[PDB]
Design a protein around this ligand. Structure first.
Ligand SMILES: [Mg+2]
Ligand SMILES: [Mg+2]
Ligand SMILES: [Zn+2]
Lengths: 150, 294, 110, 286, 131, 244, 166, 154
């Protein structure tokens, strides 16, 4: 580490879920290879899985660039502007289906230490405690051993 | 009638207006060969710009020591403000406080310190009183003090300053020294100068006297920031030059019945000629005594 | 006695960069009114002192050409004359040292 | 020299990253970067927000006059068919007006005790250049914006976010469009105080005018609590008493700051914009 | 930003004048305190048991022998009092102590080698500085 | 502990390469002009008197046998060459050679100018930004003088064609830091400079390239610079004294 | 070896616009392989760091260390280099922006000790780097005053939250 | 502890110290001006002052001739002391020499000084001069003086 890394407070993007839920995943860019054993699991994901995944997520634009490459990667871009790059090198179809779905569920905020597991903009409803909260008032607001009308 | 706080607003506009007119009169770029004639660096030549370059700029070419210690410039045997643009090619020399015969420098410093006192006199008294500056008597330096005649409202006909009031004048003078303001010199035609001081009666009379002396009939104008005044002869470049400054006393000139003229006296010493506490107290006593020009 | 441990650069910077170790600015510097060069208030000008030694050496070389050997000092006074000068009224019966050069302006005839 | 290729290739990649950090490149538009299809990115924009936009209208909501004028300059240099593209000016005027009249209605019915000057300053904050541009840079409105300069200026981006509302207004109507303003613009004042959006001066002189409208005697200021008066860290609680009835009480370091905060506390109670106020109802209208 | 001393900028003619000027002032200042009982002195109380009076500040001259009437020899030290004056007085309350303090100085020194805060203290006292 | 620095450098001359070498340095351009040209005083006045200039330019070439016989030589090595096209062709070279200074296109500048001229233009502006343009042309150019070299001086022959130009130009020179150094980019000014060209006739791949600029003693002073200058005096020694 | 300091005077900035402010001139200069210690030279480069060109030359002219005469020679030739090549109008309008020392290529000789023992001594060398900037020396930072201390302390008392809660 | 010690410890001992001071004094009488370390000159300056006192006693006084014979290694300088130097300072009773500090020498950065006999035939040294009487500060004091003198006469 916490001391060797940064941190953030729990938050959301544009108060998401308050009025309506908006999927933050905005774009998916796959880079598979026509030939290459590293991309075998990525090719089978493009034949049967990616098409059904786009039907469920119409707000996500998916790009499949088939080109020569030794390490296939999927790049996820989010509304807030964050970009997360991941490798699907030598991964089965089931492993790539749970990864892509994880990307769709995330918000884009940095995956770092979160200080508190809760966040509220209105923590108090009866008044935040202060020293005089549970103290009684005295007649004429006098202080300890204060001579009045001297 | 114009208010005191808005009377200086126009005097600057008229001053700046004429300060920008002369600059436009000069061609885009014209060169002048300024030759240095002194014991140090003999033969050096400065290829400067006309109506823009100053003696101070010529010293910046040489060294920082010339700049700090060059109080006044001697151009063709005539003293020249260090921030005054050079109009034609000519021999140049630099003057310092520590010279064999620094008579011209002493006069300039003595005149500048008087002008500084005039500025603090126009701000100390309330806005209800009419403070009208008269002139700066050209008293010698051996007299022991510099003076600046002033007139006050009829209400303050018998009011005499106290020790605490004289101290406040000094705190206003040192506050002007801390701003490090440069004396800006402007040579204008007498007719133009009358317009700026058309509101003050005493200044108009002084300007007319200067016009008669010179066939060209040009009057030198000096201003410290916003404050503007008419003075005779060159002045020092900056206010920071004066280290010790104090107004000693105020004397009422006679005859008082026709008009009341108060004489604010003072004494000062620059950083280059700093004095000792014990010696500085001796100079103040002499300054408190009234001085009369020859 | 040998060091028990190695001293770190943090400890060593604090010893080396202590104000006592640092060089102190000098405020006694000023300009020579004659040549315009720098000098200290209590020390002679190196430039003006150098031109006095060049001329003094030339005069001492002429003195040797007159004595023409060791243990030959005179029992009278000595005077230095330049091109365009003759023995003065008080410079009578002295050892005149002729110098083939114009008299320096700073060198005032007494 | 050691034989191998994997470590050298891997070391070149770290050098590139190091070089980019030392000399980061200038930002560019997302359209210029690879993997971009404008027609596919604009359809997802609507589906993402669950709205039945009209493509013909939505494409003109991102076209700006500055981009049209520059697009012509490029053709003139090359001598190159006329363009029938329309700007978003008309669409922006419709959305900006509808938004100002819909936000007002929402606020005028939620806080009926707030004056018009306060409701106007709130609408000028929710439709402000700072708030509208934050919502636009998180809804993919700056990526589709067809501007002449990048990054898109705030004013140009503000004019493009209201044109999208004008396109939605024509397509889905006011009822469906008012929910878009409640879910994206009304949610920008949740954890914010009244006088943090509506900045005022001399709140005590404003409270005396609201108490005259209600025929209430002028308030009296008094000290309820005090601590560390002589110290550099004091605490005062000033209470406003109308007819010997406490209406507000505020803290402060000085007696003047506390007297000003108390008046601010009373104004929040008068207008009903307290912290204790019940949250805005986002539930689907019945 | 360079320091200065009292005779750094003075000429050959003013150095003797300044020296004699400040020298004559010290004489007049010291010859103006020889009548303390006429210059509005403070009350003179008598001696009571348990009273503590002021002391002096002298200058050690040297040593000299001294014989008594019994024949025994004693060596003594010569302490000369020169320019000793009372500078100020602090009451018991302001003293923060059981007693009350009286300040005394000795051996007049030059005014050109003292601090401004010290010079002004003597200026209002009408005395030259003390070592 | 016996290792030292490998410092054995010695200073030699570059004037000539190793002697007794069959290979020799091949030079494409001459160093200087074969016959100095002095434009007659008052030619600047004749700029306004365009008709007199036309008369004089035609007369001078016809009257100067030496100048009229040099053209015969330039046509012995190049048949398809006219004199009523070079002055129109020189404008393209001149203009195109001063546009290579703005973009620092030295690869093409060698084709336009000679090796003797290239240093003069580029050396001073190596770390400076130049913005030169050609606004308009006032008077047509004229081939004032043509003169060829002595036959087979080194086995090669060069021909020089002096051309007079009178046109407006715009020049703004910026220093290393982008600060204005000389000239004004807004206002053009009249220029009257005689440009000289050269071509190695013997070389089959030769061409006409700028050689130098004739500077007449009666030319007006150039534009003044923006900044100020200090020209120090003698830095005398302690012993030596200053003299008027 | 690295010689990047000499390549910094070759960067050419684009012409400035009419509204942009005057850009100060920067002049880089150095001297390589000085027979002197970088630790001893560091005390001289630290002295003039931030000074004016004319004030630095005065302090090095009356210093007894050998490095003083070497730095002063580097400053004089950087001063002329500025006005002659880098378009600096006034030679006194310069101040020392950067001044430090570096280690140079050093040699190794043998120092003989008693009892047939020996040490390895190194003939030390150093570099000196200086950067001149057109303009007056930046004013020194005034010492922190009591008002700033109190203003900072109260700001820390106002930034403290309730920790480990909602 | 060195309280009261007026003489320095130079050379290789008391005798070597006198021999060092003797070689500097002998060279000062031959040339009338020399440059040497500041401490060694300040220590010899006293002997150069008292040597003239023996030259004023005359060459007929045996005691005075025994001092010069010892303190002047070159014997051609002994007549110069009694016949040239002493007559020169006949009117003066003291201050025969002037000592001035000069820039430290380059080899060892030692504190240096130049010493000479007043009245020599050598180019004048650049002596330090006090500020002119016509300066601002000195004119303010000259005016103060006049008044104090004028009031006293009254
Ligand atoms: Mg052995
Ligand atoms: Mg020893
Ligand atoms: Zn000198």
């Amino acid at each position: 580490t916490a001391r060797g890394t940064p941190s953030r407070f729990l938050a959301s993007v544009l108060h998401n879920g308050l009025g309506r839920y908006v999927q933050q995943l905005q774009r998916l860019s796959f880079s598979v290879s026509r030939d290459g054993a590293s991309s075998r699991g990525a090719r089978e994901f493009v034949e049967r899985e990616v098409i059904d995944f786009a039907r469920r997520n119409p707000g996500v634009v998916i790009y499949v660039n088939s080109r020569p490459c030794c390490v296939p990667r999927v790049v996820a871009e989010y509304l807030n502007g964050a970009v997360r790059e991941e490798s699907i090198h030598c991964k089965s179809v089931e492993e790539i289906s749970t990864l892509v779905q994880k990307l769709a569920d995330q918000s884009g905020l940095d995956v770092i230490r979160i200080r508190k597991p809760f966040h509220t903009d209105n923590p108090s409803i009866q008044g935040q405690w202060h020293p005089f909260t549970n103290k009684p008032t005295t007649f004429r607001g006098l202080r300890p051993r204060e001579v009045q009308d001297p | 009638q114009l208010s005191p706080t808005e009377l200086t607003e126009m005097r600057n506009d008229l001053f700046n207006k004429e300060k920008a007119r002369q600059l436009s009169l000069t061609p885009r770029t014209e060169k002048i060969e300024v030759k240095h004639v002194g014991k140090t660096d003999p033969g050096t030549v400065f290829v400067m710009n006309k109506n823009i370059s100053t003696p101070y700029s010529c010293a910046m070419h040489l060294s920082e020591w010339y700049c700090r210690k060059s109080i006044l410039a001697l151009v063709d045997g005539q003293p020249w403000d260090m921030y005054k643009p050079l109009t034609k090619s000519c021999e140049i020399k630099f003057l310092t406080f520590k010279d064999c015969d620094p008579g011209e420098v002493n006069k300039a410093y003595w005149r500048s310190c008087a002008m500084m006192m005039g500025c603090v006199i126009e701000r100390a008294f309330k806005d209800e009183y009419m403070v009208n500056l008269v002139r700066a008597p050209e008293v010698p330096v051996i007299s022991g003090a510099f003076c600046y005649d002033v007139v006050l409202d009829s209400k303050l006909d018998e009011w005499m300053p106290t020790k605490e009031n004289l101290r406040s004048f000094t705190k206003d003078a040192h506050a002007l020294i801390y701003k490090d303001l440069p004396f800006e010199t402007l040579e204008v035609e007498a007719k133009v100068a009358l317009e700026i001081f058309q509101h003050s009666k005493y200044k108009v009379d002084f300007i007319e006297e200067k016009a008669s002396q010179n066939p060209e009939r040009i009057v030198k104008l000096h201003r410290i920031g916003d404050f503007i005044d008419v003075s005779e002869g060159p002045l020092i470049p900056r206010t920071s030059i004066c280290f010790q400054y104090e107004v000693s006393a105020v004397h009422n000139l006679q005859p008082t019945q026709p008009s009341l003229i108060r004489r604010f006296q003072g004494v000062s010493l620059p950083v280059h000629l700093r004095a000792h506490f014990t010696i500085w107290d001796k100079l103040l006593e002499r300054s408190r005594k009234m001085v009369t020009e020859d | 006695a040998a060091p028990k441990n190695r001293r770190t650069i943090e400890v060593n910077r604090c010893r080396r960069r202590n104000p006592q170790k640092l060089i102190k600015v000098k405020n006694n510097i000023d300009v020579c009114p004659e040549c315009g060069h720098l000098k200290q208030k209590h020390v002679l000008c190196a430039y003006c002192y150098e031109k006095v030694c060049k001329e003094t050496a030339e005069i001492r070389r002429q003195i040797g050409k007159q004595e023409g050997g060791p243990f030959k000092a005179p029992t009278i006074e000595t005077v230095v004359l330049y091109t365009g000068e003759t023995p003065s009224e008080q410079d009578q019966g002295k050892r005149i040292i002729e110098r083939d050069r114009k008299r320096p302006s700073w060198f005032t005839q007494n | 020299v050691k034989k191998g290729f994997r470590a050298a290739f891997r070391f070149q990649k770290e050098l590139e990253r190091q070089r980019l950090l030392r000399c980061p490149p200038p930002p560019v538009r997302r359209s210029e970067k690879p993997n971009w299809d404008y027609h596919a990115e604009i359809q997802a924009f609507g589906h993402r927000l669950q709205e039945n936009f009209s493509l013909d209208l939505l494409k003109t909501a991102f076209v700006n006059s500055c981009y049209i004028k520059s697009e012509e300059a490029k053709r003139q240099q090359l001598g190159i068919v006329l363009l029938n593209l329309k700007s978003n000016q008309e669409l922006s005027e419709q959305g900006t007006s509808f938004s100002q009249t819909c936000l007002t209605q929402f606020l005028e019915d939620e806080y009926p005790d707030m004056p018009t000057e306060g409701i106007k300053n709130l609408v000028d904050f929710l439709t402000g250049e700072e708030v509208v541009c934050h919502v636009a840079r998180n809804l993919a409105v700056e990526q589709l914006t067809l501007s002449e300069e990048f990054p898109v200026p705030p004013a140009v981006l503000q004019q493009t976010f209201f044109a999208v509302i004008g396109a939605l207004l024509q397509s889905s109507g006011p009822e469906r469009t008012a929910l878009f303003i409640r879910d994206f613009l009304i949610t920008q004042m949740t954890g914010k105080e009244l006088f943090e959006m509506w900045k005022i001066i001399n709140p005590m002189g404003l409270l005396v005018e609201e108490l005259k409208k209600r025929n209430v005697s002028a308030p009296e200021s008094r000290l309820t609590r005090q601590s560390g008066g002589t110290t550099a860290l004091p605490l005062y609680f000033v209470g406003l008493y109308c007819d010997k009835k406490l209406i507000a009480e505020g803290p402060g370091e000085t007696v003047l700051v506390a007297e000003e905060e108390a008046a601010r506390v009373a104004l929040r109670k008068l207008y009903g914009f307290t912290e204790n106020r019940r949250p805005w109802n986002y539930s689907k209208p019945k | 930003k360079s320091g200065t001393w009292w005779d750094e900028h003075l000429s050959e003619e003013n150095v003797p004048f300044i020296k004699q000027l400040v020298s004559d002032e010290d004489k007049a200042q010291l010859a103006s305190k020889l009548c303390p009982l006429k210059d509005e002195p403070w009350p003179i109380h008598p001696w009571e048991p348990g009273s503590f009076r002021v002391g002096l500040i002298a200058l050690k001259l040297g040593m000299m022998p001294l014989w008594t009437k019994d024949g025994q020899k004693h060596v003594v030290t010569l302490l000369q009092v020169q320019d000793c004056h009372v500078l100020k007085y602090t009451s018991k309350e302001n003293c923060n102590g059981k007693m009350a303090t009286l300040s005394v100085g000795g051996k007049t020194v030059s005014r050109f080698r003292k601090a401004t805060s010290i010079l002004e203290f003597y200026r209002e006292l009408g005395l030259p500085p003390k070592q | 502990t016996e290792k030292e620095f490998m410092q054995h450098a010695r200073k030699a001359g570059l004037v000539i390469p190793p002697e007794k070498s069959d290979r020799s340095i091949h030079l494409a351009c001459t160093a200087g002009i074969f016959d100095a040209y002095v434009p007659p005083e008052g030619d600047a006045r004749i700029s306004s008197l365009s008709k007199e200039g036309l008369i004089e330019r035609t007369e001078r070439m016809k009257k100067t046998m030496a100048s009229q016989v040099s053209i015969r030589r330039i046509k012995d090595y190049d048949a398809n060459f006219k004199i009523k096209d070079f002055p129109e062709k020189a404008k393209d070279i001149f203009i195109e050679a001063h546009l290579c200074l703005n973009n620092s296109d030295h690869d093409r500048l060698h084709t336009l100018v000679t090796e003797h001229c290239f240093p003069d233009m580029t050396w001073d502006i190596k770390y400076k930004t130049v913005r030169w343009s050609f606004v308009e042309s006032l008077e047509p150019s004229h081939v004032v003088q043509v003169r060829c070299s002595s036959m087979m001086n080194q086995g090669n022959v060069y021909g020089q064609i002096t051309v007079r130009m009178h046109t407006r130009q715009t020049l703004a020179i910026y220093d290393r830091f982008g600060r204005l150094m000389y000239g004004q980019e807004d206002v053009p000014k009249d220029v009257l400079e005689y440009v000289v060209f050269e071509k190695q006739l013997t070389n089959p791949y030769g061409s006409w390239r700028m050689h130098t600029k004739i500077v007449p003693p009666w030319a007006p002073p150039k534009q003044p610079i923006l900044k100020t200058v200090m020209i120090p005096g003698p830095q005398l020694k302690p012993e030596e004294e200053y003299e008027e | 070896i690295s010689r990047k300091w000499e390549k910094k005077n070759k960067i050419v900035y684009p012409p400035q616009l009419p509204g942009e402010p005057r850009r100060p001139a920067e002049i880089y200069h150095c001297r390589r392989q000085i027979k002197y210690s970088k630790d001893k030279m560091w005390y001289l480069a630290k002295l003039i760091r931030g000074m004016s060109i004319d004030q630095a030359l005065a302090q090095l002219e009356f210093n007894d260390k050998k490095g003083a005469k070497i730095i002063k020679e580097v400053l004089l030739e950087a001063q002329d280099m500025a006005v002659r090549d880098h378009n600096v109008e006034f030679r006194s309008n310069l101040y020392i922006a950067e001044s430090t020392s570096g280690r140079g290529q050093c040699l190794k000789r043998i120092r003989y000790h008693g009892r047939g023992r020996f040490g390895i001594m190194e003939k030390v060398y150093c570099h000196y780097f200086v950067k001149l900037v057109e303009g007056p020396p930046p004013p020194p930072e005034p010492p922190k005053t009591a008002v700033a201390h109190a203003k900072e302390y109260i700001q820390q008392l106002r930034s403290r939250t309730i920790v480990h809660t909602l | 502890i060195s309280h009261g010690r007026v003489f320095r410890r130079m050379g290789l001992g008391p005798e070597s110290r006198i021999h060092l001071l003797r070689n500097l004094l002998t060279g000062l009488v031959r040339h009338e001006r020399i440059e040497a370390p500041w401490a060694r000159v300040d220590e010899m300056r006293g002997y150069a002052e008292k040597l003239i006192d023996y030259g004023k006693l005359g060459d007929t006084n045996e005691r005075a001739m025994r001092m010069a014979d010892f303190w002047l290694t070159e014997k051609d300088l002994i007549p110069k002391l009694f016949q040239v130097l002493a007559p020169r300072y006949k009117d003066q009773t003291g201050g025969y020499t002037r000592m001035l500090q000069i820039p430290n020498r380059s080899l060892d950065r030692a504190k240096m000084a130049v010493i000479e006999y007043k009245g020599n035939c050598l180019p004048p040294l650049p002596l330090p001069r006090r500020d002119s009487h016509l300066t601002l500060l000195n004119q303010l004091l000259q005016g103060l003086r006049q008044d104090l003198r004028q009031s006293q006469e009254a």
